[PDB]
Coordinates of C-alpha atoms in Angstrom, one line a residue:
Chain A
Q1 CA 9.3 -36.6 36.1
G2 CA 9.5 -35.6 39.3
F3 CA 12.7 -33.6 39.7
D4 CA 13.8 -31.3 42.2
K5 CA 16.2 -28.5 40.5
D6 CA 17.8 -28.1 43.9
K7 CA 18.6 -31.9 44.6
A8 CA 20.6 -32.2 41.4
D9 CA 21.8 -31.1 38.3
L10 CA 19.5 -31.0 35.4
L11 CA 21.9 -32.2 32.6
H12 CA 23.5 -34.8 34.8
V13 CA 19.6 -36.3 35.8
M14 CA 19.0 -36.0 32.1
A15 CA 22.1 -37.6 30.6
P16 CA 20.9 -41.3 31.0
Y17 CA 17.6 -40.4 29.1
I18 CA 19.3 -39.1 26.4
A19 CA 21.5 -41.7 26.3
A20 CA 19.1 -44.2 26.0
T21 CA 17.6 -42.3 22.9
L22 CA 20.3 -41.0 21.4
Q23 CA 21.8 -44.7 21.2
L24 CA 25.2 -43.6 23.1
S25 CA 26.7 -46.0 25.0
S26 CA 28.0 -43.6 27.9
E27 CA 26.4 -41.5 30.0
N28 CA 29.2 -39.1 30.5
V29 CA 29.3 -38.4 26.5
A30 CA 25.4 -37.6 26.6
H31 CA 26.2 -35.1 29.3
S32 CA 29.1 -33.7 27.3
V33 CA 26.5 -33.8 24.5
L34 CA 23.8 -31.5 26.8
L35 CA 26.9 -28.9 27.9
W36 CA 27.9 -28.7 24.7
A37 CA 23.9 -27.9 23.2
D38 CA 23.5 -25.6 25.9
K39 CA 26.8 -23.6 24.5
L40 CA 24.9 -23.7 20.8
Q41 CA 21.6 -22.8 21.9
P42 CA 20.5 -24.3 18.6
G43 CA 17.2 -24.0 16.9
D44 CA 15.2 -20.9 15.5
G45 CA 14.2 -20.8 19.5
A46 CA 17.3 -20.4 21.2
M47 CA 16.9 -24.0 23.3
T48 CA 18.4 -24.4 26.7
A49 CA 18.1 -27.9 28.3
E50 CA 16.6 -25.9 31.0
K51 CA 13.8 -24.8 28.3
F52 CA 13.7 -28.2 27.2
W53 CA 12.5 -29.6 30.4
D54 CA 9.9 -26.3 31.2
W55 CA 8.0 -27.4 27.6
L56 CA 7.9 -31.2 28.7
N57 CA 7.1 -30.6 31.9
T58 CA 4.0 -28.2 30.9
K59 CA 3.1 -28.6 27.6
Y60 CA 4.0 -32.3 26.2
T61 CA 1.7 -35.2 26.6
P62 CA 3.5 -38.5 26.0
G63 CA 1.9 -40.5 23.1
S64 CA -0.5 -37.6 21.5
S65 CA 0.2 -36.7 18.1
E66 CA -1.1 -33.1 18.1
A67 CA 0.4 -29.6 17.9
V68 CA 2.2 -27.9 20.6
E69 CA 2.6 -24.1 20.1
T70 CA 6.7 -24.3 20.3
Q71 CA 6.9 -27.8 19.0
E72 CA 9.2 -26.9 16.1
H73 CA 11.8 -25.5 18.4
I74 CA 12.2 -28.7 20.4
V75 CA 12.5 -31.1 17.6
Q76 CA 15.5 -28.5 16.5
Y77 CA 17.1 -29.0 19.8
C78 CA 17.0 -32.8 19.4
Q79 CA 17.7 -33.0 15.8
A80 CA 20.5 -31.0 17.3
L81 CA 21.6 -33.5 19.7
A82 CA 21.4 -36.2 17.3
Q83 CA 23.9 -34.1 15.2
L84 CA 26.3 -33.8 18.3
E85 CA 26.4 -37.5 19.0
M86 CA 27.2 -38.0 15.2
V87 CA 30.0 -35.8 16.1
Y88 CA 31.3 -38.1 18.8
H89 CA 31.4 -41.0 16.9
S90 CA 33.0 -39.9 13.4
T91 CA 35.8 -37.9 15.0
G92 CA 37.0 -40.9 17.1
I93 CA 37.7 -38.7 20.2
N94 CA 37.9 -40.3 23.4
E95 CA 35.1 -40.0 26.4
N96 CA 37.1 -37.8 28.5
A97 CA 38.9 -35.6 26.0
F98 CA 35.5 -34.6 24.8
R99 CA 34.2 -33.1 28.0
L100 CA 37.2 -31.0 27.8
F101 CA 36.6 -30.1 24.3
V102 CA 33.0 -28.9 25.3
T103 CA 34.2 -27.4 28.5
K104 CA 37.2 -25.8 27.5
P105 CA 37.1 -24.7 24.0
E106 CA 40.3 -22.7 24.4
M107 CA 42.4 -25.1 25.3
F108 CA 42.0 -27.1 21.9
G109 CA 42.1 -23.4 19.7
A110 CA 39.0 -21.8 20.3
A111 CA 38.6 -17.8 21.5
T112 CA 38.2 -17.2 25.0
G113 CA 34.7 -17.5 26.3
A114 CA 33.3 -18.7 22.9
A115 CA 31.0 -21.4 22.1
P116 CA 32.8 -24.4 20.4
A117 CA 32.0 -24.9 16.9
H118 CA 30.9 -28.2 15.1
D119 CA 32.6 -26.3 11.7
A120 CA 34.6 -28.4 9.4
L121 CA 37.9 -26.8 10.2
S122 CA 36.7 -27.9 13.9
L123 CA 35.7 -31.2 13.2
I124 CA 39.4 -31.5 11.2
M125 CA 41.2 -30.6 14.3
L126 CA 39.0 -33.4 16.4
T127 CA 40.2 -35.9 14.0
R128 CA 43.3 -34.8 14.3
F129 CA 43.9 -34.8 17.9
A130 CA 42.3 -38.3 18.2
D131 CA 44.7 -39.3 15.5
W132 CA 47.3 -37.5 17.9
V133 CA 46.0 -39.4 21.0
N134 CA 46.0 -42.6 19.1
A135 CA 49.4 -42.3 18.2
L136 CA 50.4 -42.1 21.8
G137 CA 49.4 -45.7 22.3
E138 CA 49.4 -46.8 25.7
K139 CA 51.3 -43.5 27.3
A140 CA 48.2 -41.8 26.2
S141 CA 46.5 -41.5 29.2
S142 CA 49.5 -40.0 31.1
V143 CA 49.6 -37.1 28.1
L144 CA 46.1 -36.5 28.2
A145 CA 45.9 -36.3 32.0
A146 CA 48.9 -34.0 32.0
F147 CA 46.8 -31.9 29.2
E148 CA 44.0 -31.9 31.0
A149 CA 46.3 -30.0 33.8
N150 CA 48.6 -27.3 32.8
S151 CA 51.5 -29.9 33.5
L152 CA 52.6 -31.3 30.5
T153 CA 56.2 -31.0 29.5
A154 CA 58.5 -31.2 26.3
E155 CA 60.2 -34.1 28.2
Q156 CA 57.0 -35.9 29.0
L157 CA 55.3 -35.4 25.8
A158 CA 58.3 -36.9 24.1
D159 CA 58.9 -40.2 26.0
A160 CA 55.3 -41.0 24.9
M161 CA 56.0 -39.9 21.2
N162 CA 59.4 -41.7 21.1
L163 CA 61.3 -38.5 20.2
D164 CA 64.3 -37.1 21.6
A165 CA 63.3 -34.7 24.6
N166 CA 65.6 -32.0 23.2
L167 CA 64.1 -32.3 20.0
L168 CA 61.0 -30.9 21.1
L169 CA 62.7 -28.3 23.6
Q170 CA 64.7 -26.9 19.9
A171 CA 61.0 -27.2 18.6
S172 CA 59.6 -25.4 21.3
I173 CA 62.4 -22.2 21.3
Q174 CA 62.2 -22.2 17.4
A175 CA 58.0 -21.8 17.5
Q176 CA 58.8 -18.9 20.9
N177 CA 60.7 -17.2 18.3
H178 CA 59.0 -17.1 15.5
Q179 CA 55.7 -15.3 14.4
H180 CA 53.0 -17.6 14.7
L181 CA 49.3 -16.6 14.5
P182 CA 48.4 -17.5 17.2
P183 CA 51.5 -17.3 19.4
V184 CA 53.0 -19.8 21.0
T185 CA 54.1 -18.7 24.4
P186 CA 55.9 -20.2 27.0
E187 CA 52.6 -20.2 29.3
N188 CA 50.4 -22.3 26.7
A189 CA 53.5 -24.1 24.5
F190 CA 52.1 -27.4 25.9
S191 CA 48.5 -25.9 27.1
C192 CA 47.1 -25.4 23.8
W193 CA 45.9 -27.8 21.3
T194 CA 47.3 -25.2 18.3
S195 CA 50.7 -24.7 20.1
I196 CA 51.4 -28.4 20.6
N197 CA 50.2 -29.0 16.7
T198 CA 52.4 -25.7 15.9
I199 CA 55.8 -27.1 17.4
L200 CA 54.9 -30.8 16.0
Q201 CA 55.0 -28.9 13.0
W202 CA 58.4 -27.8 13.4
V203 CA 59.3 -31.7 14.2
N204 CA 57.7 -32.7 10.8
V205 CA 59.6 -30.4 8.7
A206 CA 62.5 -31.1 10.7
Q207 CA 62.5 -35.4 10.2
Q208 CA 61.4 -34.4 6.2
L209 CA 65.0 -32.6 5.7
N210 CA 66.9 -34.4 8.5
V211 CA 67.8 -31.3 10.2
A212 CA 67.2 -30.1 13.6
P213 CA 64.8 -27.5 14.3
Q214 CA 67.4 -24.5 14.1
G215 CA 68.1 -25.6 10.9
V216 CA 64.9 -25.0 9.6
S217 CA 64.8 -21.9 11.4
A218 CA 68.0 -20.8 9.6
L219 CA 65.9 -21.8 6.3
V220 CA 62.9 -19.4 7.2
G221 CA 65.0 -16.8 8.2
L222 CA 66.4 -16.6 4.4
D223 CA 63.4 -15.4 3.3
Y224 CA 63.7 -12.8 0.9
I225 CA 61.2 -10.0 2.1
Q226 CA 61.4 -10.8 5.7
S227 CA 64.9 -10.1 5.2
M228 CA 65.0 -7.0 3.5
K229 CA 65.7 -5.4 7.0
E230 CA 68.9 -7.6 7.7
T231 CA 69.9 -8.8 4.2
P232 CA 71.6 -12.5 4.6
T233 CA 75.2 -12.8 3.6
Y234 CA 76.6 -15.0 1.4
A235 CA 78.1 -16.7 4.3
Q236 CA 74.9 -17.4 5.8
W237 CA 73.3 -19.0 2.6
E238 CA 76.4 -21.1 2.7
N239 CA 76.1 -22.2 5.9
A240 CA 72.8 -23.1 5.6
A241 CA 73.4 -25.0 2.2
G242 CA 75.6 -27.5 4.5
Chain B
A1 CA -0.9 -49.9 48.4
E2 CA -0.5 -46.4 47.6
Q3 CA -4.2 -46.2 48.7
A4 CA -3.3 -47.7 51.9
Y5 CA 0.0 -45.4 51.9
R6 CA -2.8 -42.6 51.7
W7 CA -4.9 -43.8 54.2
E8 CA -2.2 -44.9 56.7
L9 CA -1.0 -41.4 56.3
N10 CA -3.5 -38.3 56.0
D11 CA -2.3 -37.5 52.5
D12 CA -3.8 -37.2 49.1
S13 CA -1.5 -35.3 46.9
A14 CA 1.1 -37.9 47.8
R15 CA 1.4 -40.2 44.4
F16 CA 4.3 -42.7 43.9
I17 CA 3.0 -44.6 41.1
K18 CA 3.4 -42.5 37.9
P19 CA 2.5 -43.5 34.2
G20 CA 4.8 -44.6 31.8
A21 CA 6.1 -47.9 33.5
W22 CA 4.8 -49.4 30.3
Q23 CA 6.7 -48.5 27.3
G24 CA 4.8 -49.8 24.3
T25 CA 7.9 -49.1 22.1
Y26 CA 9.8 -51.6 23.6
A27 CA 7.2 -54.1 24.2
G28 CA 7.0 -52.8 27.8
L29 CA 10.5 -54.0 28.8
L30 CA 11.6 -53.0 32.6
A31 CA 8.0 -52.5 33.4
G32 CA 8.5 -54.2 36.8
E33 CA 12.1 -52.9 37.2
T34 CA 10.4 -49.4 37.2
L35 CA 7.2 -50.5 39.3
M36 CA 9.7 -52.1 41.8
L37 CA 11.5 -48.8 42.2
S38 CA 8.2 -47.1 43.2
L39 CA 7.3 -49.5 45.3
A40 CA 10.4 -49.1 47.1
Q41 CA 10.0 -45.2 47.3
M42 CA 6.6 -45.9 49.2
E43 CA 8.1 -47.9 51.4
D44 CA 11.2 -45.5 52.2
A45 CA 8.5 -42.5 52.3
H46 CA 7.0 -44.8 54.6
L47 CA 9.6 -45.5 57.2
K48 CA 10.5 -41.7 57.6
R49 CA 6.8 -40.8 58.1
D50 CA 6.2 -43.7 60.5
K51 CA 5.5 -43.0 64.3
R52 CA 4.7 -44.4 67.6
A53 CA 1.0 -43.0 68.0
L54 CA -0.3 -41.9 71.3
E55 CA -2.9 -44.6 71.7
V56 CA -5.8 -43.0 73.2
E57 CA -9.3 -44.6 74.7
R58 CA -12.2 -42.6 75.5
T59 CA -15.7 -43.6 76.7
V60 CA -18.4 -41.8 75.8
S61 CA -21.7 -41.7 77.5
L62 CA -24.7 -40.7 74.6
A63 CA -26.9 -40.0 77.9
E64 CA -24.6 -37.5 79.0
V65 CA -24.0 -36.3 75.4
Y66 CA -27.8 -36.2 74.6
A67 CA -28.4 -34.3 78.7
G68 CA -25.1 -31.7 78.4
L69 CA -26.2 -29.9 74.8
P70 CA -27.1 -26.4 74.0
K71 CA -30.7 -25.0 74.9
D72 CA -31.5 -24.1 71.6
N73 CA -31.0 -27.7 70.3
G74 CA -33.1 -29.3 72.3
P75 CA -31.0 -31.4 75.1
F76 CA -33.1 -34.6 76.4
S77 CA -32.9 -37.5 78.4
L78 CA -32.0 -40.7 76.5
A79 CA -33.9 -43.4 78.8
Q80 CA -36.6 -41.5 79.0
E81 CA -37.6 -40.3 75.2
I82 CA -36.4 -43.7 74.2
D83 CA -39.0 -45.1 76.1
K84 CA -41.7 -43.0 74.4
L85 CA -40.1 -43.3 70.9
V86 CA -40.6 -47.0 71.1
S87 CA -44.2 -46.8 72.3
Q88 CA -45.3 -44.4 69.4
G89 CA -43.8 -45.0 66.1
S90 CA -43.6 -41.6 65.1
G91 CA -41.4 -39.5 67.7
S92 CA -38.4 -37.5 66.9
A93 CA -36.0 -36.3 69.7
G94 CA -33.3 -33.6 69.7
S95 CA -31.9 -32.0 66.5
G96 CA -28.9 -31.2 64.2
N97 CA -26.6 -34.5 64.0
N98 CA -27.1 -35.3 67.6
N99 CA -30.8 -36.4 67.2
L100 CA -32.6 -39.5 67.8
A101 CA -35.3 -40.6 65.5
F102 CA -36.4 -43.5 63.4
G103 CA -34.8 -44.4 59.9
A104 CA -35.9 -42.6 57.0
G105 CA -34.9 -45.4 54.4
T106 CA -37.2 -47.8 53.2
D107 CA -36.6 -50.9 55.3
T108 CA -35.4 -48.5 57.7
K109 CA -38.9 -46.9 59.6
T110 CA -39.2 -49.7 62.0
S111 CA -35.5 -48.8 63.5
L112 CA -34.4 -46.7 66.2
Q113 CA -31.5 -44.8 65.0
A114 CA -29.5 -42.5 67.6
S115 CA -26.8 -40.2 66.1
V116 CA -24.0 -38.3 67.4
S117 CA -22.1 -35.6 65.6
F118 CA -18.4 -36.1 66.3
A119 CA -17.6 -32.4 66.5
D120 CA -19.8 -32.1 69.6
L121 CA -17.9 -34.4 71.4
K122 CA -15.1 -32.5 71.5
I123 CA -12.5 -34.9 71.8
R124 CA -9.9 -33.0 70.1
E125 CA -9.5 -30.6 73.5
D126 CA -8.8 -33.6 75.8
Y127 CA -5.2 -33.0 74.9
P128 CA -3.3 -30.0 73.8
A129 CA -2.4 -29.3 70.1
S130 CA 1.3 -29.4 70.7
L131 CA 1.2 -33.5 71.1
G132 CA -0.3 -34.1 67.3
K133 CA -2.5 -32.3 64.6
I134 CA -3.4 -35.6 62.9
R135 CA -6.2 -37.2 65.6
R136 CA -7.9 -40.1 63.9
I137 CA -10.2 -43.1 65.1
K138 CA -8.6 -46.5 65.9
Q139 CA -11.3 -48.6 67.1
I140 CA -15.3 -47.9 68.0
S141 CA -16.7 -50.3 70.3
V142 CA -20.4 -50.2 71.5
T143 CA -21.5 -51.0 75.1
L144 CA -25.1 -51.2 76.1
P145 CA -26.0 -51.9 79.4
Chain C
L1 CA 29.6 -60.8 -5.9
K2 CA 26.4 -58.5 -6.3
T3 CA 24.5 -61.4 -4.7
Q4 CA 26.6 -61.6 -1.7
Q5 CA 26.4 -57.5 -1.8
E6 CA 22.6 -57.7 -1.8
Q7 CA 23.0 -60.6 0.9
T8 CA 25.4 -58.6 3.5
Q9 CA 22.8 -55.7 3.3
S10 CA 20.2 -58.1 3.9
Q11 CA 21.6 -58.9 7.2
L12 CA 22.3 -55.3 7.6
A13 CA 18.8 -54.7 7.0
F14 CA 17.8 -57.3 9.0
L15 CA 20.2 -56.2 12.3
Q16 CA 18.5 -52.7 12.1
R17 CA 15.3 -53.7 11.5
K18 CA 14.5 -56.7 14.3
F19 CA 13.2 -56.0 17.7
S20 CA 16.3 -56.7 19.6
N21 CA 18.5 -54.6 17.9
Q22 CA 21.2 -51.8 19.4
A23 CA 18.8 -49.5 19.6
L24 CA 16.7 -51.5 22.4
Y25 CA 19.8 -52.2 24.5
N26 CA 21.0 -48.6 24.7
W27 CA 17.4 -47.9 26.0
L28 CA 17.3 -50.7 28.2
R29 CA 20.8 -50.1 29.5
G30 CA 20.4 -46.0 29.7
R31 CA 16.6 -46.6 31.6
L32 CA 18.0 -49.3 34.2
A33 CA 21.1 -47.7 35.1
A34 CA 18.8 -44.4 35.9
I35 CA 16.7 -47.0 37.8
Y36 CA 19.6 -48.8 39.5
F37 CA 21.4 -45.6 40.8
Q38 CA 18.3 -44.4 42.3
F39 CA 17.5 -47.8 44.0
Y40 CA 21.1 -47.7 45.1
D41 CA 20.3 -44.6 47.3
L42 CA 17.0 -46.7 48.5
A43 CA 19.0 -49.5 49.9
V44 CA 21.6 -47.7 51.4
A45 CA 19.5 -45.8 53.3
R46 CA 17.8 -48.9 54.6
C47 CA 21.5 -50.2 55.6
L48 CA 21.9 -47.3 57.2
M49 CA 18.4 -48.0 58.9
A50 CA 19.7 -51.2 59.9
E51 CA 22.9 -50.1 61.4
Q52 CA 20.9 -47.6 63.6
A53 CA 19.1 -49.7 64.6
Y54 CA 22.1 -51.9 65.5
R55 CA 23.3 -48.9 67.3
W56 CA 20.6 -48.6 69.3
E57 CA 20.0 -52.3 70.4
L58 CA 23.5 -52.5 71.6
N59 CA 25.1 -49.0 73.0
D60 CA 27.8 -48.0 70.7
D61 CA 27.6 -44.7 67.9
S62 CA 31.3 -45.3 67.3
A63 CA 30.7 -48.8 65.2
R64 CA 29.7 -48.3 61.6
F65 CA 29.4 -51.1 59.1
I66 CA 28.1 -49.3 56.0
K67 CA 30.9 -47.9 54.7
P68 CA 31.3 -45.7 51.5
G69 CA 32.0 -47.0 48.1
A70 CA 29.9 -49.7 47.5
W71 CA 28.7 -48.0 44.2
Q72 CA 31.6 -47.2 41.8
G73 CA 30.6 -44.9 38.8
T74 CA 33.5 -46.0 36.9
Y75 CA 32.4 -49.6 36.5
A76 CA 28.4 -48.5 36.3
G77 CA 27.6 -49.7 40.0
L78 CA 28.2 -53.0 39.5
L79 CA 28.6 -55.1 42.4
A80 CA 27.0 -52.5 44.7
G81 CA 24.8 -55.3 46.1
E82 CA 27.3 -57.7 46.8
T83 CA 29.1 -55.3 48.4
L84 CA 26.0 -54.2 51.0
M85 CA 25.1 -57.7 51.2
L86 CA 28.8 -58.2 52.8
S87 CA 28.2 -55.6 55.2
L88 CA 24.9 -56.6 56.1
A89 CA 26.2 -60.4 56.8
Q90 CA 29.3 -58.4 58.9
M91 CA 26.5 -56.6 61.2
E92 CA 24.6 -59.8 62.0
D93 CA 27.5 -61.7 62.8
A94 CA 28.3 -58.9 65.1
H95 CA 25.1 -58.8 66.6
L96 CA 25.2 -62.9 67.2
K97 CA 28.3 -62.1 69.4
Chain D
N1 CA 14.0 -32.1 87.9
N2 CA 11.8 -33.5 90.5
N3 CA 9.3 -30.9 90.7
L4 CA 5.5 -30.7 90.2
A5 CA 4.2 -27.6 88.6
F6 CA 2.5 -26.5 85.3
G7 CA 3.6 -26.5 81.6
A8 CA 5.7 -23.7 80.3
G9 CA 4.4 -24.1 76.5
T10 CA 1.5 -22.1 75.1
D11 CA -1.1 -25.1 74.8
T12 CA 0.8 -26.5 78.0
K13 CA -0.4 -23.9 80.5
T14 CA -3.6 -25.4 82.3
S15 CA -1.9 -29.0 82.3
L16 CA -0.2 -30.3 85.5
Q17 CA 3.1 -31.7 84.8
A18 CA 5.0 -34.2 87.2
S19 CA 8.5 -34.1 86.8
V20 CA 10.9 -37.1 88.1
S21 CA 14.7 -37.2 87.6
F22 CA 16.2 -40.9 86.6
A23 CA 19.6 -40.0 88.9
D24 CA 17.2 -38.9 92.2
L25 CA 15.6 -42.6 91.8
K26 CA 18.7 -44.4 92.3
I27 CA 17.7 -47.8 90.2
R28 CA 21.3 -48.5 89.6
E29 CA 22.0 -49.4 93.2
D30 CA 19.2 -52.1 93.3
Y31 CA 21.6 -54.9 92.0
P32 CA 25.4 -54.9 92.4
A33 CA 27.4 -53.4 89.2
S34 CA 29.3 -57.0 88.9
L35 CA 26.4 -58.2 86.9
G36 CA 26.0 -55.4 84.1
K37 CA 27.2 -51.9 83.2
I38 CA 24.7 -51.4 80.5
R39 CA 21.1 -51.0 82.4
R40 CA 18.5 -49.5 79.9
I41 CA 14.7 -49.0 80.0
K42 CA 12.5 -51.6 78.4
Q43 CA 9.3 -50.6 79.6
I44 CA 7.3 -48.0 81.8
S45 CA 3.9 -48.7 82.6
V46 CA 1.6 -46.1 84.5
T47 CA -0.7 -47.1 87.5
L48 CA -2.9 -44.2 88.8
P49 CA -4.7 -45.6 91.2
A50 CA -7.8 -42.9 92.0
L51 CA -11.4 -42.3 92.4
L52 CA -12.5 -42.4 88.6
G53 CA -16.3 -42.6 88.0
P54 CA -17.0 -45.3 85.9
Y55 CA -17.1 -44.9 82.1
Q56 CA -15.1 -41.5 82.8
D57 CA -11.4 -42.2 81.9
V58 CA -8.2 -40.1 83.0
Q59 CA -6.0 -38.1 80.6
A60 CA -2.3 -38.3 81.0
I61 CA 1.0 -38.0 78.7
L62 CA 3.8 -39.4 80.1
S63 CA 7.1 -38.0 78.3
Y64 CA 10.9 -38.0 77.9
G65 CA 13.0 -35.1 78.3
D66 CA 15.7 -35.5 75.6
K67 CA 14.3 -37.6 72.1
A68 CA 18.0 -38.0 71.2
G69 CA 18.6 -41.7 70.0
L70 CA 14.5 -42.6 69.8
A71 CA 12.4 -43.2 66.9
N72 CA 10.2 -41.3 65.4
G73 CA 7.3 -41.0 68.7
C74 CA 9.3 -43.6 71.3
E75 CA 9.7 -40.5 73.3
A76 CA 6.1 -39.9 74.8
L77 CA 2.9 -42.6 76.1
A78 CA -0.7 -41.7 76.6
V79 CA -2.7 -43.0 80.0
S80 CA -6.2 -43.9 79.5
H81 CA -7.4 -45.7 82.2
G82 CA -4.5 -45.6 84.6
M83 CA -4.5 -49.3 85.6
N84 CA -1.0 -50.6 84.8
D85 CA -1.2 -49.5 81.3
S86 CA 1.2 -48.7 78.6
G87 CA 0.3 -46.2 75.9
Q88 CA -0.3 -49.4 73.9
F89 CA -3.7 -50.6 72.9
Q90 CA -2.3 -54.2 73.2
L91 CA 0.7 -54.8 74.4
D92 CA 3.7 -56.7 72.6
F93 CA 7.1 -57.4 73.2
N94 CA 7.4 -60.0 69.8
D95 CA 6.8 -56.7 67.9
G96 CA 9.3 -55.4 65.5
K97 CA 9.3 -52.1 66.9
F98 CA 10.6 -50.5 69.7
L99 CA 8.6 -49.9 72.3
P100 CA 7.9 -46.5 73.8
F101 CA 11.0 -45.4 76.2
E102 CA 12.9 -48.1 75.2
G103 CA 16.7 -48.0 75.4
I104 CA 16.6 -45.0 77.7
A105 CA 19.5 -45.4 80.2
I106 CA 19.1 -46.1 83.5
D107 CA 21.0 -43.2 85.5
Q108 CA 20.4 -40.4 83.2
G109 CA 17.1 -38.5 81.9
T110 CA 14.1 -36.8 83.5
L111 CA 10.8 -38.1 82.9
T112 CA 7.5 -36.4 83.1
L113 CA 3.6 -36.9 83.3
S114 CA 1.3 -34.5 82.2
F115 CA -2.2 -34.3 82.8
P116 CA -4.3 -31.7 80.5
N117 CA -6.7 -29.6 81.3
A118 CA -5.7 -29.5 84.9
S119 CA -6.5 -26.6 86.8
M120 CA -9.7 -25.7 88.6
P121 CA -10.3 -21.8 88.0
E122 CA -9.7 -21.9 84.4
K123 CA -12.0 -25.2 84.2
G124 CA -10.7 -28.1 82.7
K125 CA -12.0 -31.7 82.4
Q126 CA -9.4 -33.3 84.9
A127 CA -10.1 -31.0 88.2
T128 CA -11.8 -33.1 90.0
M129 CA -10.0 -36.1 89.4
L130 CA -6.6 -35.2 90.3
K131 CA -8.1 -34.1 93.7
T132 CA -8.5 -37.4 94.2
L133 CA -5.4 -38.8 93.0
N134 CA -3.3 -39.9 95.6
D135 CA -0.1 -41.1 94.1
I136 CA 1.6 -41.5 90.7
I137 CA 2.9 -45.2 90.2
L138 CA 5.1 -46.3 87.5
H139 CA 6.0 -49.8 86.7
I140 CA 9.3 -49.3 85.0
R141 CA 10.8 -52.5 83.1
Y142 CA 14.4 -52.3 82.3
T143 CA 17.4 -54.5 81.2
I144 CA 20.8 -55.2 82.8
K145 CA 23.5 -56.6 80.1

């Protein structure tokens, strides 16, 4: 009450009071939920935090139990804020990457300029991201700070994973040479989470078969219909068997 | 304290103590922390609006005010009219808010009351308006020679 | 064990229904941290007002005592008043000398 | 800056203002410089020895030109009776506030005493007083440290 729009941001002023009533330990997480919810525009009436304060400042009387004309759209906005509070606690993602997932969804594999999703395919990648961060251990801050910038390299991530640096280099090379959807480009090889998750699946398949990633690449080059253009010789099967 | 703030400075639209310091659902906890912030916003607003006043005295002679007065409102001499408004009990001299008559109350009938309009004193034209728009009484003292 | 399950549930139902539960202290912390930050801007304002009085009673404008960073937002602004109270004690010691 | 003319403002045209440069007063040469380099105004009080009709008081504003490091309102002062007066109703050195003009340097500045409603042909209250005024006297109290 008594808020000037010019002096401060609405969502940052409103973030302590949202965290006070959504049972959030952090005001920064509450600011993330308000930024997220402005991208969703939840409810029947497409609710933004600016529309939410215009309703409170004009039409809401505190303590009165009456029917305001657009009260049910406000409730759906507050039901949404509690939903995304639950998304944060259930996925186990940390506070700073949840900023990054709200503000830069493309860095987590979403389309360009797209609002993020609390889809079940998007909840499963936040959990697999949070499991990925927790596996990094004490070097997880150095990876996420280099992931928030575009400075994350294969040599740096392999140090935190206790892998060989040439293993993630060769896994990145075989990911860029093969037809992935979405593609793995040297620009985003360690910038997007989808590309990082793709490169690590070259690592996990190679560790399972106890081969190098180019041994896996030799194996997927023996695909029957992919090699109806250039048929592999018996020697290429004989080398891949060895 | 807000009424004292609204009286030391000419403003009535400026309010600092706002409802909802008591939240009954939380047993009224942090009600004093909310009010102590509100008291600190009056005092910060008071310090930024306080001035050294231009403290001005002005002496007003009511005989001069009643003599110098427009002729359609009946100017008079104070010393002469009182001497005959005390001799009879029914007199009334002057008009408007600059008159001199007896009281209209019940206990006020035998009391001579001399009345002066502030706007007819023309005190605001003594100093130019570039100095200050707020011009307010500090003290009135009476001399009856 | 079915009794212990019901007894564990009664303690869990007690922690959620008591008045001094977690939802109280989320409300108390979220509201007080909003008050404490707004009160911080008011008190630094008068620490700077006292410095302007220090800069006017003595002819100096290059001498500053209230320096930024009493509020550390990463630590919720804790020890902001202890930092300013030291800074007020450095004006008064400099004033006495 | 030692002139004597009418004001150049809008409401200031009928006001006679007498102006004095501090550097032409040569106050710093009164005591030798071994005592103290910092020499600053503590209080200025005005005396206007003039044929004031009793119960008809003088009206004047003592102002300072810069308003630089002064507090809100410390740049000006009002003269009511003109007999060793400050602007204040009661003078308090033990008051917690700065006095008007306190802290101004001895060396620099320009001090101006303005008499509103001065001129005779455009009719003003203060016309007949200023014809009888012989000199303007300033009691400057300052500080050497």
